[PDB]
Write a protein that binds this ligand. Structure first.
Ligand SMILES: Nc1nc2sc(CCCCc3ccc(C(=O)N[C@@H](CCC(=O)O)C(=O)O)nc3)cc2c(=O)[nH]1
Ligand SMILES: NCC(=O)N[C@@H]1O[C@H](COP(=O)([O-])[O-])[C@@H](O)[C@H]1O
Length: 200
């Protein structure tokens, strides 16, 4: 399966995906890394790994659909099968999400359905949970509302901040995101016609 990773920041999940997909038994190959920000560590990790890169600036497109269309064009040029959102901090349009239904994964730093949205660690800390985690899911039109592929629980420790909790959750993210990509790329997990998740 040919994989595109879309990034926006440091790309520690990108690095985890690079590491696992280079293993001999990987059913996925990362063929392109796409960023909406042109000076991010993620781009450098891709270049270090010999992966082509492309930067798409919203400042050249009139709307989301136009911008996602630019992404989609690069995906088609690279004959991409699967899209991983790895710290990608834009919201995707309906048609783009519709087109990639069942073929786009996202990593979210909470145990969904808890703490949907942008500041999941702050939400978890304000709520007082003692257990949080991360979730790999298929991307649906409702943000953080697609089918769940894998999750991993992570303890919250007294005195945690966004800094320390995100650090601990990310170790978990670096495990389930590669596993999830491997499950989808091998066809072991798929989105069934009923929109439910199938283990084959
Ligand atoms: N179509 C589609 N596109 C996308 S992109 C993606 C990865 C994450 C992108 C960054 C992001 C993700 C979510 C939010 C957000 O909702 N913020 C709320 C917080 C809500 C609350 O507090 O409860 C607020 O601003 O208030 N902001 C930025 C997932 C996804 C998806 O599932 N569907
Ligand atoms: N659902 C959106 C969201 O909050 N994404 C979060 O952004 C970070 C990117 O880290 P990375 O650049 O080290 O992969 C990840 O920790 C991920 O949980």
């Amino acid at each position: 399966a040919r994989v595109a990773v879309l990034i926006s920041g440091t790309g520690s999940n990108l690095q985890a995906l690079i590491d696992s997909t280079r293993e001999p038994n990987s059913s996925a190959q990362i063929d392109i890394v796409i960023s909406n920000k042109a000076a991010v560590a993620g781009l450098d990790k891709a270049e270090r790994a010999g992966i082509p890169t492309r930067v798409i600036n919203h400042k050249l497109y009139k709307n989301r659909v136009e911008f996602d269309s630019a992404i989609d064009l690069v995906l088609e040029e690279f004959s991409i099968d699967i899209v991983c959102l790895a710290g990608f901090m834009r919201i995707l349009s309906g048609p783009f999400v519709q087109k990639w239904n069942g073929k786009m994964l996202n990593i979210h730093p909470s145990l969904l359905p808890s703490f949907k949205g942008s500041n999941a660690h702050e939400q978890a800390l304000e709520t007082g949970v003692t257990v949080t985690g991360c979730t790999v899911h298929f991307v649906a039109e409702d943000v953080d509302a697609g089918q769940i592929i894998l999750q991993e629980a992570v303890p919250v420790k007294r005195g945690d901040t966004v800094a320390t909790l995100s650090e601990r959750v990310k170790l978990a993210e670096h495990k389930i995101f590669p596993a999830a990509l491997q499950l989808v790329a091998s066809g072991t997990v798929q989105l069934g016609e009923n929109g439910k998740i199938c283990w084959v």
